[PDB]
Amino acid sequence: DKICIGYHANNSTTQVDTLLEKNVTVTHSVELLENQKEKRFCKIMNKAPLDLKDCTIEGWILGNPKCDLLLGDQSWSYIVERPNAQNGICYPGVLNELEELKAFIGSGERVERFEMFPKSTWAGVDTSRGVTNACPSYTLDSSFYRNLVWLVKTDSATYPVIKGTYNNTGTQPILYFWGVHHPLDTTVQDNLYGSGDKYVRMGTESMNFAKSPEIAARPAVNGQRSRIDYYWSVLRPGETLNVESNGNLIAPWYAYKFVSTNKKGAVFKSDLPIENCDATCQTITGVLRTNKTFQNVSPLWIGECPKYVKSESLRLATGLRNVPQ
């Protein structure tokens, strides 16, 4: 007659590492790291992302005539920008504070497009001849940004002082754009805006802007040796904007009522497909469906994700050393 004391053994071949010992087979364990993803973009909080497709952020928000599919109101849980998108700034020139603009847009959730300055705002000038073959649409060789208007002096007169005002009486901040044209020579200048020293001046309660054309021939881009300095700002609720120019003004026309996300906001640069699915965790390289604590898929995500870590495995022993006999 006898009684023995002993411990569990099983068919497990799963191993863990310890400080003293590698590859120890244990009866029970738990993996804390997720290495699996669904290679696609899904909805977050049942809200679809915004696919830019063949437009860049600049082309979308400026109103590049080839980004008309996107034109108007948009809501999004995040933004997918495609790596080799072609439709951005068509008429050569720099978008000022571009990186700050992208960060701002990324912090958003919804834009409502609206006419801020009807062309009737600008008195004694031409608002119908501001096109270029630098900016074609899909139907004409010569168009221009939907949200801007290229102002040219009329028939043969001078370019007079034009003025504009918008009072933000709404509850939302307004994202808007404008430009200054820089002709390649003094003839083009004279032919478009006439003679004299020209300026573009803008001001709000908290912002004021002043620029003058800088005439010189730059290398040709999209057939143009001239340039445009694009600009952007945010007109706060309760603020009013004053515009004043006597030439070289690319005027704001349409603008955006901007809803800022309370959350995080993401801009994913990816060529991954957007499918019809829901998710709680969306990384730039795919969706995670886990209850796990760690993941080695990506540090870039939107939603509620596990902690990013470089490890291949974080296997925690729970059972004891497996010693079957």
Partner: protein, 171 residues
């Protein structure tokens, strides 16, 4: 193992004991059988479950990297952001990998100790009445039926009830 029980003086585990981590194999006139010690098993399950959840709970924050861009003339801040992100990624990877190695070592010691303490618990009850074979097994100097077996397992073994019979067979 530092307690010397698991893969020690008790050389192997029991595939035949399927209902718990620690337990007994008994053998008498009514036959043989395995049985888990539910109390020490449950206590261990509770401790280890607590350890796992505590780790999960402390690792329940995330450092968030951003998609922010930087121009050609923002090389300094661009690289600051990069070194920062890589910075936290390195400390958290370290924290996770090191914790797991440390915790695995201590988890295995815990089990080792528990098996060890269960063995001592039985040795302390039997004393004279059984012979310790040095492998976790005790041979009784008396007849131990099913209720005697169960008394050893719930810690109510009656030493003086069996000492005369044991002493006779022992000497």
């Amino acid at each position: 193992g530092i307690f010397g029980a698991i893969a020690g003086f008790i050389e192997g585990g029991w595939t035949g004991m399927i209902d718990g981590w620690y337990g007994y194999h008994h053998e008498n006139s009514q036959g043989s059988g395995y049985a888990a010690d539910r109390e020490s098993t449950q206590k261990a399950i509770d401790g280890i479950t607590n350890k796992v959840n505590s780790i999960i709970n402390k690792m329940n924050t995330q450092f968030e990297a951003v998609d922010h861009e930087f121009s050609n003339l923002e090389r300094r801040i661009g690289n600051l952001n990069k070194r920062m992100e890589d910075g936290f990624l390195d400390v958290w990877t370290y924290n996770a990998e090191l914790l797991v190695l440390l915790e695995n070592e201590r988890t295995l010691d815990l089990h080792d100790a528990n098996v060890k303490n269960l063995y001592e618990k039985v040795k302390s009850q039997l004393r004279d009445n059984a012979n310790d074979l040095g492998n976790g097994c005790f041979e009784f100097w008396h007849k131990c039926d099913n209720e005697c077996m169960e008394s050893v397992k719930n810690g109510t073994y009656d030493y003086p009830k069996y000492q005369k019979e044991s002493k006779l067979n022992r000497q």
